[PDB]
Every structure is written in C-alpha cells, then in structure tokens.
From Swiss-Prot, chains A, B, C:
Signal peptide: none annotated. InterPro entries: Leucine_aapep/pepB, Macro_dom-like, Peptidase_M17_C, Peptidase_M17_leu_NH2_pept, Peptidase_M17_N. One of its GO terms (cellular component) is cytoplasm. It comes from Pseudomonas putida (Arthrobacter siderocapsulatus). The lineage of its organism: Bacteria, Pseudomonadati, Pseudomonadota, Gammaproteobacteria, Pseudomonadales. The keyword Cytoplasm applies. The keyword Manganese applies. Gene3D superfamilies: Leucine Aminopeptidase, subunit E, domain 1, Zn peptidases. This is Cytosol aminopeptidase. Presumably involved in the processing and regular turnover of intracellular proteins. Catalyzes the removal of unsubstituted N-terminal amino acids from various peptides. GO terms for biological process: proteolysis. Belongs to the peptidase M17 family. One of its GO terms (molecular function) is manganese ion binding. Mn(2+) 2 binds at residues 267, 272, 290, 351.
Amino acid sequence: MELVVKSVAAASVKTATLVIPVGENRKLGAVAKAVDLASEGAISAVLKRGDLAGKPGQTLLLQNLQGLKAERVLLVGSGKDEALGDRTWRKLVASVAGVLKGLNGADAVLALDDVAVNNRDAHYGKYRLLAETLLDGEYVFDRFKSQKVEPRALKKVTLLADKAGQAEVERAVKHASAIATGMAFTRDLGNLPPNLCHPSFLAEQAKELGKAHKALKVEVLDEKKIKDLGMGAFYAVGQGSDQPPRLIVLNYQGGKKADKPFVLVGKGITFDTGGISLKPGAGMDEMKYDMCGAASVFGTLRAVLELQLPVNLVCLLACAENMPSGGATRPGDIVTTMSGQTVEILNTDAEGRLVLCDTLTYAERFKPQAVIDIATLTGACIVALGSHTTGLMGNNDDLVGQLLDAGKRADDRAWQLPLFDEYQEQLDSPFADMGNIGGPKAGTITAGCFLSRFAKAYNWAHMDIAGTAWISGGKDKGATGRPVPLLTQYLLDRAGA
Amino acid sequence: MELVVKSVAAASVKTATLVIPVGENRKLGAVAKAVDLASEGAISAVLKRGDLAGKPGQTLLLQNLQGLKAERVLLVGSGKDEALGDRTWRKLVASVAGVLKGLNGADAVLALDDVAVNNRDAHYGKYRLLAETLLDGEYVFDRFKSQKVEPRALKKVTLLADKAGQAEVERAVKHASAIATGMAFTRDLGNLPPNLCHPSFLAEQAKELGKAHKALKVEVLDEKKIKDLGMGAFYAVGQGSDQPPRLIVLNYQGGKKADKPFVLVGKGITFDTGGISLKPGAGMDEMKYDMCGAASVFGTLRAVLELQLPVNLVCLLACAENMPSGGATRPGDIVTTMSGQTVEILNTDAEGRLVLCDTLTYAERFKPQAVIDIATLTGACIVALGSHTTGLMGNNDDLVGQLLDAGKRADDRAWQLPLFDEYQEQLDSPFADMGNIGGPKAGTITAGCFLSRFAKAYNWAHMDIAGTAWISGGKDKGATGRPVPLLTQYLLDRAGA
Amino acid sequence: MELVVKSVAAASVKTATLVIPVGENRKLGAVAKAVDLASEGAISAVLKRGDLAGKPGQTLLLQNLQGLKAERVLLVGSGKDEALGDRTWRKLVASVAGVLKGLNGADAVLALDDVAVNNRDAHYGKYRLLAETLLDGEYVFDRFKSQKVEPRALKKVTLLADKAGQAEVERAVKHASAIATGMAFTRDLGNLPPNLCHPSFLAEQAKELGKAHKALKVEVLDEKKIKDLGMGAFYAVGQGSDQPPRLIVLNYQGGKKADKPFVLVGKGITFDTGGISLKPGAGMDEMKYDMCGAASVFGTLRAVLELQLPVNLVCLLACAENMPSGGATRPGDIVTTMSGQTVEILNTDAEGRLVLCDTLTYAERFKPQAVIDIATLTGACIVALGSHTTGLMGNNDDLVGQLLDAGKRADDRAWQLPLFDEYQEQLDSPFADMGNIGGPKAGTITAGCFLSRFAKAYNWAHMDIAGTAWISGGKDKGATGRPVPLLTQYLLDRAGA
Ligand SMILES: [K+]
Ligand SMILES: [K+]
Ligand SMILES: [K+]
Ligand SMILES: [Mn+2]
Ligand SMILES: [Mn+2]
Ligand SMILES: [Mn+2]
Ligand SMILES: [Zn+2]
Ligand SMILES: [Zn+2]
Ligand SMILES: [Zn+2]
C-alpha cells in the first residue's frame, strides 16, 4: 500500500473514495464544507436525515454525487468541536480503513485536515499516528492458510494537506512507513510457528538482511562459540534442545566512525516450554512469542535501514529454544557467566535473563553510549502493567527519561519501575553469587535487578514487553510489533531527524 | 522510652552506656576520637587487637574505662568511609538498640554525631530516622502471652549534638516521637485478633479518642445509617457477618474555620475470608491485617493530635467484616452505590474497593483539598512492588508528587502506577455501569481505576499497602505501621512544620 | 580447627580467649569461681550489674583482666542449675563458636567442666557432642562464590578436664573428629550442583578414595554391566538421562578374613526430576539432595577409614540421574529385577526404591551380617517424622534396636515404623509381581515393604532420611551431615571402640 501527500482541493481530485470528517450536530469544518458546496449540497441534504450522529469513528457511505470527481464519499465522525485524544484518533482512522478494506476501490483520498488531535501538532504528530495505524492495519498473516485469501482492491491512499504543512506531512509519512514496515517484519517473525521459527532460522534471516544493505554486516555465533566465550548461562538455557542456540550480531554503521554506538539486546527464546521446570499446558502455544524481544530488534533495524538514519547501531539477538530432555539444565545447576559471576539456576523457566546476562557482558566490546535490552521477561509484568504499557527499568535516569519520552511521542508508552537495593537480597543464594529468581514478590523488578548486575559498564535500560508484544485471544490474536515505535522514535530523537 | 537531646561532651556524661561509632579503617571521627583521648587511647588499644571490623552495625561492648564517667562503652560499626544510605543507618541504630535492650542499664547516651547519612542534613533528617527506628524498635505486643515480658531496664535515651544543631535535633525527636507513637497504635490495631478487633470495637476506639481530645469530634454511622445513605456497595460487603459494618468519622479542626480539609480514607476490613468467593485456608490468619488502611489513619491522626498540627483533617474509616453465610453477598449481585453508579459484584473478595467507593462519595461533603485512600487492596501490588514500596495512583499529578516526596523524606517510599484510560474498559459489565474486577492483568491498576470513578469531584490519590503494611513470617511477623510516616510527613509538609 | 585436651588449671593458661560458664542466678561452679577468685573478683563484680541473665547460649565478653593469663574472657549462660538436654548443650556450644569465630584470636580454651549433660558421661558423651558441634560448625561451602570470606583467625581450641578424665575426652575428640570429617565430605557431595555431581563424578570420587587408602578396593559397574547382571529396575531409572547410571562398590577389609561384612547401601540419585511423572517446579533445586543416601555412606566410609576400625565394610552406591526424555521409562513399564521378581513402574518418581532393590540383590554375594540401606526416599516420611528424626524399618529386631540405640548415643535419632504384612497388599499388581507404589496411605511404610521383598537373605534395615538429610531454607539451607553420626556410632559399637 502506497501512501502520498498532495495539496489540492478535496473536490478536485479523481478517486474511488473520498473521505471527510463530520462532527456531532452535522457540523462541517472548512474542508468538508467545500466538498458539500462542490456536491451541490448533496452531503448536507443527506445529513439532515440523521443517520450519522457524528460520533468519532461513525461512518455513512455515499455513492457518486453530481459535481464531484469521487465515485464514493465516506463521512466519518470526528466528535464534538474538540481536540481528539490519541486513542480516539487512531480508532477513527482504523474505522475508516475498515470500510475501505471492504470496498472495490483501487485508491482513496483522506481529507481530514480539519480534525485536531490533542497535544499533537497538525502536520507531523497528527499524521504520524494516522499513517502508522493505516499501514499497520493492512497487516495480513495468511501464509499457513491453504485457502489463498481474496486479494484486496485498495493499493493507494492519498493524504490532503494545505501547502504550508505538506513537507511536514511527508516527513510523518516517511517515518510511519519505516515504522510500519519494521512492525510487519516483527509480527511475521513473532507469528511464525516455533517448528519453522527457531534460532538457526533467525540466523539465516539476519544473514539475508546483511546481504541486502551496504552499511550492515552480520556475524552468527553458534553453540560452540557461545560456550568457548565462557557464556555458561546462555549455554545452559539452550543445551536441552535439538535446535542449538545462536547469538546473532547485526552491526549497522550509519554514523561517523568515532560515534559510540547504541546497542539493542533482544531476548530470542524461540520457544519456551519452561524446560525441566515445565510450564502448564494451557495457553502454552503463546510461548512462540517469547522471541518477540529479538523480533522487535529486527523490526527496529529494518526501519532505521529504511530511513538510512545517521547512527551506529549494534543489534545482539540472544536466541535459544527452552526444551526438556535427557540433557537439559536442572534446577539447582550452578553455571559460570561470561562476566565471571556464578548463578544458581533455581528455576529453568527464568531463562530469558540467563541468555540476556551473557549477551550484556558481550555488549561491552562495543563501548556503547546506551544499551537497551528488550524481553518478554515476566508473567509479573502483565499483573503489574497489563497489556497497554511496557515495563521499563534502567541504571541511568536520563536514558530511561529519554525512552519514556519517546514512548509518549510514538504513542507506544512505557512506565518506569524502581530498582531499589532492598530488592537485591531476594536474589541471594547460599552457594553461588546469585540465584536466578527472587520469589513471588516484585517479579518484574527482581528480573531487572538480576540483569543490572551485568550492565555496570555502561548506560542501560531494560524493557519488559511480556504484556505489550502480543494479544492472547479474539480476532486480533498475534504479535503487535511493539515496541518498534518506541525504539525507532528513540533513535529518531538521537539522530535529530 | 523517653528521649532527650543534650549538647555536652560525650567524655563527660554520667550514664549506664555510652555509644560511639567506629569506621572500617578502625577510623574514629571527632567524637569517638575525643572519647579515646579521654581514656588515653584505651579504645584504640582494643581496636588494635582487631575483633571489631566496623562493618555497619557490628558491635564491641566494653565496661569501665578510666577517664570516662560511662559505666559501659558500646562501639558500633559505621562501615566503609562514606555517607550511609537510609537502610544501613537504620540497621546501625537497630543493632545498637538490640544490644541496649539486653543490658541492665536504665539509661544510655548516644554519641553518634560523626555519622553522615547520604543526602540528609546532620540534625533534622539524620535524627528523624534514628529517633523513629529506636522508638519504633521499642514495640512489644505481648498482651496475649501468659508469660508477659518483664520490663527492660532501659527507660531513657540522650542524644548528643553540638550547641548549634540542638534545636534541629529536637524538632526531629518531636516529630519522630509523634510518628512512633502513631505507629504503635496502628500496630496494636493491626495485631489484634479478629474476634476482638471488629468494626464496633474500632468504633469504640474512635469514641474514646474523641472524648480524650478537645479539637476532635467523632461520629459513628452504623449499618442501618450506611444502608439509608444508599451506600449499596459498603452494605453489601458487611451484610454476611454477625458483626455489623461501621462508618467512622473523626473530624479534627486544627486549621482556621474555612481551611479546606485533608481527607484520609481507610480500608477497615477487620477480617477478610473472601466471603462467598472464599479464600484458601493457608495464610488466612493474616487477613486480620486487611484493616491496616484504617489503622494507619488512626495512627496518623494520633500523630497529628500529639503535634497539634494546624490543619483540618477528616478521617473516614470504612469498616466491615467479610464473612460467608446464608445472607452474604453473591457473586453476580448488582448494587447501587451512593454515587448512583451501579456495580456488579463479580468477586466478593474484591470487597475493599466496595467499602471505599461509597466512602469516597461520602467525602464530597467536606469540600476537601485532597482525599487520600489507604488500603491493603491487592496481592497484585505485592507482585508489582513487593514488600518495600507502597503503590500509589491518583487523579492529580501535584498531589501524587507531594505524596512521593513525603515518602522519600520519611524513608517510607511509594511509587506511582499509571491510571491510563485503556485500563478502564477491563471493568465493563454488560449489566451494570461497572464490574468490581478486571481480570488477572494489571490488578493493582484496575482497582485504582475502579476507585477513580468515585473521586472525580476532588484531588485524589490512592495507596495500595497490601505489601508494606505487615510482615508474613519469622519472629518479625506483624504490622509495620506503614504508612504512618509518609502520611504524617505529608501533613507536616502541608502545615509547613 | 585443631582440638586438644589439657588438664591444667583454667586461670593458669595463656590464650586469646578463655571460655567459662555462668548459671542462671549469677551462679558460678568451681572452675568459674577459681577464675573469678584469680581475677580477684572482677568477673563477679561485672555479673552483679545484671547484663548477663545466664540463659543458655547468652554471652558477655570481657577484656584483659588483672590476675588472668587470657586476653579475653567469654562468659556463656548455662541456664537453670539442672543437667542440660543434648539440644540445649549443643546450642550453648554453637553460640560460643559463633562468638569466637568473629574474634581476632588464634585460639580459645573451653573450661566448661562444670556443665552437666543429662544422661551423659562427664568425659566421653558430653564431649562427643561438644567436639562434633564445634568441628561441624566450621563447615563452609564457598567454592562457587567469587568473593570469599578470608580464613578465620581461630585455628586451635583446648578443652580442659581433670587428669582422671583426660584419656576419655581425647577418645571423644577423636571419634568426633572422624565423624565431623565424614560429615564434611557428605555435605560437600550433597551441596555440589547436579550438572557437576552426576553418577560418573561420584564414580571418579570413589576411585580417588580407593587410591588414597591401602585397605580399600573400589570397583565401578557402568550402565551395560548393570543391564547385563539383570538389573531391570536399576537400568530403567537411569536410561532417561544423558548421564548413565553407575553402581559403585567400595570394599574395606578392616577385620579378619572370615568376619562377615557390614553392608551399607546408598541411594545416589544425583538429580531427581521425577522423570515422566514430572515433579512440580517449586523447590525442585532441592532434589540435588536426592543422592544424600550415597553421600552419607561415602562419609561414614571416610570416618571408618580415619579411625581404622577393625571391621569388614562394603559400601554399595546406586547412582542414576532421573530425567525425562524420548527414551525415559514410562509409568506402566514392567521390568525384570535381578532377583527375578517383576515390577510394574506405576510412577517414575518412585525411583529410589528401584535402584535400591536391584542393589540389595547384589549385596547377597558378600554374605553380610547386616545390610542397611540409606535413602531420601519419601515425602511421606517428612509428614510422618519431620526434620528431627530419621525413619527406620527392617526385618530383624536386633539390627533395628542396634541402629536406634546408636542414634540415641550419637544424638542423631531415628524412630522405628512397622512393616506389618497388611501393608504388602497395597503393592499388588494385576500384571507384574508387584507395583512400585501403594498409594496415598502409609507411604514411608509401603516403600519399606517394597524393599523388604529384596532383603530376605539377610538381616536388613532401611533408613528414610528424606527429612533429616538437608535443611530447606534460610541461610542454613544445605546438606546436614546426617546420618553419618548414627552410622559411624553403629560401627563403633560393633567394633567395640
Ligand atoms: K515465533
Ligand atoms: K487486626
Ligand atoms: K548433589
Ligand atoms: Mn521462561
Ligand atoms: Mn478481599
Ligand atoms: Mn522420586
Ligand atoms: Zn522466556
Ligand atoms: Zn480485603
Ligand atoms: Zn528420589
């Protein structure tokens, strides 16, 4: 789906479907009034009948009107004469996109310049959200349906703005396209079943990506190299599986050579059975989304690759399959981490932090200005912050402050949890430097505490996306692509773009 | 224990025990060094033998040394030569108090001026913490023992500071004694068993308190009156018990006539079986702690009275006993709250938000500038923040910040959780305006959202103390008195005292 | 630590710390009084102030006193003037040791002659417990710790008795040293994590032990040898794992060629996941303790080796790792045991009885006079007898009675449970000769009943140490040395030592 920006009058442009907003009590703003006049008052005449209340996202569809160049006109409600909230705005757009998806229209024109969005500027912010909701809402994962699905009609959507703001709208389109494309890659990887989507499969994907872009080199470290580096924790996790582990390094050099890089570390547990500390059966299929941390890294890279952003970015994907078997790790195993700290593995289902901890030690060789790890780490985060808000912790306030502020602008929000010292004692072990679990209280936090012990060489934040990376049921069961919008926004901020 | 401040020389005072700090270097600050000189290096001489490494809270006790008028000299470790964190400083004080209580001295002097506590001034803050830990450490709940403890010898403690800081150390003792006195009261009500501590009992407690204080008037609304004001949620909660519910009003007029009051609302569920949604048996004895919200309001009120703070403070205590029986509330019951909103009671074990929502409506009549509800509300908060940090939510950023700030200075921390709108819809009911539960995701937060719907009329905040109000096991098992220090400190800030 | 015995006067000896007892009521026995009198009433003067009440294990530390040759004097409470229970006596000792271990002195003198121990000799039995408690208290397992505790200052302890008592206190110290040394070996083996401590590791340890001792021949039977001897039940347990089973034979000829040997059989399940009948995750790490039967025999052997007792001793260690996999035993498998009896494995988590049954058959070839198996066999036993007392069953009343008495004199107690015939029907199988479980009733007993069917050719006894072999939680969590004291004492009894 192509998305473009033009500065012509709404009435003038030839199209399968023209879309304009209507407020409560039949209130037409400037753009919409011009279309009414140009349609010889056909639009205000139908509105007099009361079928459209004007509530945000409500629609009434018209078919072609004399004096117009549009085959169809779609009236969408924009609510009272007030700024819309983010959420309300996005729902208005998806509701539009929803009527268009069911039309035999090859193209559509959105003439929604009169809608104001709250705390959002009228050209960039407004449309960043519209463009992202629209392109992300075309996402289809029909690849394992043996009935090849009916190919859609819609291929082109044009956005109309005034001349003055056109450049700013195009900047929003460019960015949202980048993010939208990164989210599709993320969602594809997340939705892919674990029999096909294993670490080696992920290794192959990184290599292919590396063969497609000039500024990106990829290096894959296998099971033996993981072990040889002294990554005892990473190795312990993966050893129980017939599919061996991979540590994938995706190095994009887009800034100056002396620029200290940004490092993204993503948990890539391609399936999580719990291991010997086996999970219950119910809903275990959703554990294919335990590599969504690694998937959000792929997607963020794919968007920056698209934007050719001027930064150095090193991606590290810690990938393993957590399986039970005759050679799997046992509860009670003590291993030596790459850092030289010893860890008693009291629960083999707290394995994300184990692969992550050696990878964080590994990230030191890059001398980063920031290291962010992204993981579907804890059940406790879902209890804490539910489905809507990413868990965020770090050893540097300004860095967490930056990530927080990026989420607010992307509309992909995080929320900070504290790493107080009182929480550290929960990881105490009678025998090793630390245990890998802190018990049933403060589960998101003690996981954060565990990781922080390995992130002391640099500025570091940690993102628990256990709640935000997929949807468990209903129609829209699947990966969401979060937090690609946040991380991409944070990198955009860093790039001054 | 009686607490006084003096500014005379440590070497000089007549006392059973003189306490001085000693660092890891086997270092001595000014005071300990003066004490050593007055004993011609006898203290340095013992340290040379090396039994005391001076880690925070390690102790070496000595008897009569020549030069000194102190019968005993207690040496306490202060650690690595730094300013101490709060926790460490408090553990130092507790170790001292531990040793002191096990001696037959009627009396002790603390000569601790040399110790620095990180980011706290040497006279007010430093001593607010010391004085609180020492006095709160005196607490004994031995009322149900046949073999009662036979009183400790220690009945007075003198703190030494220099002439100049004396007024400030003294204000710290004043406030600290009020707080420690409020906490003892809160802890007694908490620890009391639920066959003795029921809603009528707490009513009686509150009447006595009314009679004893001139500036305080107490009103007790019984079950019939609760029913008549149309409090459908509150009544539904208490109806299954033989012990009827009470709504207790303690109105303290300490400010001017038309100073807008502060309102504290306490959850006073004196026992929580869960009701028809019965809780499992294990650990249920701890549900006598489900009235720790109300208990912490009593305690803060006591502290305020002792301090004669110039503010109007209205305390509303929402008291019921949650019992299964032939007339108890069913899951699926629909009740009409005092606000007029209807609630479907899907789970009878989410009863605290039910007594609280009617009380929040009741708080509107006092025209408050801040309403703060305190409640042992959700096991989810324990999952979120564990035992160290109180959860905090509200409808007003400045009030929330004020409470956060008060926690930091009181060493009784809270931490904010968001009340985003997307959580709201987890309470939707096909039948009533809302349900009382939102599923297993973001439980602490959804309980806050439930509550915000009854606080739209004023500045409001909510503290979930399920994880900070008591200790589950060990010889430490019992009420902690949190959050009396934060609440008190906030009110002091509001009085500017 | 080195322990010596002297018969000199308490006051007359030069030490870093002299330890003497003080009664409840300020009371001093003879030895305490001579110290007091030599220090010319210093001690008594101090006592008069009332700091030390004299409850058992209470202490008061003094520093250097005119008239004595000790740098420090440690007073320890000894309670009411009666003879102490074992438990109170061992606590007093452990308090003393905890104090001495934080002091910077090279040695200590224990002058505790005046303390009586209920039902024990003032020379041998009293000091067996003292010397063991103090030597076993020295235990540290810190090999997986990056930051270690630097070696203690305390290296030597002297015990003062009167000359008529000396030879017997020395005999107590010597039996207790061997015991403690065996316990340390046992605790090391138990605490080692299962990734390191597997059947092949234990085999290597036995071979090393057989190299260090001329009187010991070791022999190691691997997986295929276990299979070829017809050990269908032993083999089924181990087949699931990447780590193969080992049956370890350690032969100590200390008696005449024609003395019937004593046989000790150890359950050595190095990790127990339950297998296909998989255990829950919670506290599974503790199952590294499932080789504590084997560990306790290793450690009894070391003690027997240290003491050179003149007996024939054969140790048989039945070692396997119980793991789930594509080749693991299934519930419902029927195997043929070495005895020719067939067993239906109805639950794979009842595996210890399976390795042991085959091994009991193997024990026959040595023509033993007694066969004692030692196993962490059943959760039922912890429900039956707690942490304090080992379960004991057998087919001979004299053997059982001998083990019971041994446990009493050693203060490592057991308790007999009945093997009534009525219980044997619980093991009936409609297909095989017997199933390996008999259900929710009499669970420790039916395991006993099970094993007795393989022990008919000799006098036999079975010890279920599931509750006495390790401590679950807190900072004492770890293997205990039990039952090394009982087993060693039983053999001392047999040897007439
Ligand atoms: K996947
Ligand atoms: K109570
Ligand atoms: K072990
Ligand atoms: Mn897991
Ligand atoms: Mn409840
Ligand atoms: Mn088992
Ligand atoms: Zn995982
Ligand atoms: Zn409750
Ligand atoms: Zn076992």
